[PDB]
Amino acid sequence: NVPHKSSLPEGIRPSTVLRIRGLVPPNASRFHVNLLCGEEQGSDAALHFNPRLDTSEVVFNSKEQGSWGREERGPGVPFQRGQPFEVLIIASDDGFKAVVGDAQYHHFRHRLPLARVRLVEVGGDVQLDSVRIF
Amino acid sequence: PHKSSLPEGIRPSTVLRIRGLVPPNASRFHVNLLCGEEQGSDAALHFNPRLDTSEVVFNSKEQGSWGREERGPGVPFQRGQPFEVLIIASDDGFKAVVGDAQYHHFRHRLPLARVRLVEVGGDVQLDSVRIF
């Protein structure tokens, strides 16, 4: 399953929807969904979606030229060890809408131009069902 | 006969998630994006899967009259089986997603800023409708 990579050579425009489905395994610690600007190592991360079950948090951040931005946090962790999940990452002109389950979870304002995203990466302690880009 | 009101309309990058299942002896159902609460109001999108004819019709009703019909490949709705529909609004049009693949791209004919209501009716058992 992981590390899972979906290459977007043409990039993603606004109104693109990332649908991520999978299971949070028993004893999971944390996993991540990255929107990177390239296939190379250390590429700029327009979005770092990092649910942390060991600390019961979800961290949002970006990375530009090796430096991490300031972390944002959503209301609690909407994931459970031993439970499946469905995440929507909806890219708008203003930013990324993160939907978990049946409710909007957090809006991450754009820190990098959306037109730079060219890679979706899923890693960490997660057993992926499917990654689909609409 | 389910309706969902939208007072401030829908901006681009709006997602409409529809979940449900078609009855075993069902023919056709629809999802409409109307321009107001009034009856017979203009429709920016008409999403009408046709199971008896094995087709899916896209159209728009303007000034009371229907426009030129568009049709998607085949029908991704099997009788007696559940489904999940996404209608994604962009600057260019509506991306209709069925299942795990994009089914059709309906380019805007009416201004998106006019959509004020989402109505789902016909031969469909509606389980949940969410707007993100």
Residue numbers in the entry:
A (entry chain A): 2 to 135
B (entry chain B): 4 to 135
Would you copy out the relevant sentences from the publication that reported this structure?
pmcHuman galectins (GAL) are oligomeric β-galactosidase-binding lectins assembled from small (∼15 kDa) protomeric carbohydrate recognition domains (CRD). Among prototype galectins, galectin-7 (GAL-7) is recognized for its preferential expression profiles in normal epithelial cells. For example, while extracellular GAL-7 can trigger apoptosis of activated T cells following binding to glycoreceptors via its GBS, it can also bind E-cadherin on epithelial cells independently of its GBS.
We finally prioritized individual substitutions G16S and F135S, as they caused the largest ΔΔGB among all remaining variants. Based on our computational predictions, mutations G16S and F135S should weaken GAL-7 homodimer interactions, while formation of a disulfide bridge in G16C could strengthen protomer interactions and favor GAL-7 homodimer stability. In contrast, the G16S variant displays 32-fold lower dimer affinity relative to WT GAL-7 (KD = 1.88 μM), indicative of significant homodimer destabilization induced by the mutation. Consistent with our MST results, G16S was found to be the least stable homodimer, with a dimer interaction energy of -11.6 ± 0.1 kcal/mol. Conversely, the G16S mutation weakens GAL-7 stability, inducing a 9.1 °C decrease in melting temperature. One of the most significant structural rearrangements between WT and G16X apo structures occurs in the local environment of residues 8–17 (loop 1), which exhibit significant atomic-scale deviations in the variants. This local rearrangement of loop 1 involves Gly16 and its neighboring residues, particularly residues Pro10, Glu11, Gly12, and Arg14.
